[PDB]
Amino acid sequence: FEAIFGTFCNRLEWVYFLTSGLAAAAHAIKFHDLNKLTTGKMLFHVQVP
Amino acid sequence: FEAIFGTFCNRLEWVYFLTSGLAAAAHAIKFHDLNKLTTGKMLFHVQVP
Numbered sequence: 137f138e139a140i141f142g143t144f145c146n147r148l149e150w151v152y153f154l155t156s157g158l159a160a161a162a163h164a165i166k167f168h169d170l171n172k173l174t175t176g177k178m179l180f181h182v183q184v185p
Numbered sequence: 186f187e188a189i190f191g192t193f194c195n196r197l198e199w200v201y202f203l204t205s206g207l208a209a210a211a212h213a214i215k216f217h218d219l220n221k222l223t224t225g226k227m228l229f230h231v232q233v234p
Contacts, residue, residue: 178191185197 153159167173202208 172186174187176188176190178193179189180193180195182195183197 153162154164202213
């Protein structure tokens with residue numbers, strides 16, 4: 137006879153964005169109406185000494 | 186729609202003469218401007234050993 141000694145499968149490992157140290161550079165925010173948004177902007181006012 | 190989520194202003198830092206290290210070389214006094222005819226004559230007799 138031929139014998140089969142067990143069958144194995146790949147135990148995949150999971151990666152998350154907020155767990156990576158690269159996330160330190162990001163400030164992550166969820167926004168449900170994002171698909172409706174066209175463009176976003178910020179404005180700065182500077183007076184020099 | 187279009188979004189604005191920032192307005193910012195520049196926070197100035199103040200500088201003073203008396204709080205600077207350069208002021209140590211000075212002897213700064215505030216006095217009236219009583220029209221002293223170009224008072225460029227300070228005459229000194231300094232004792233010499």
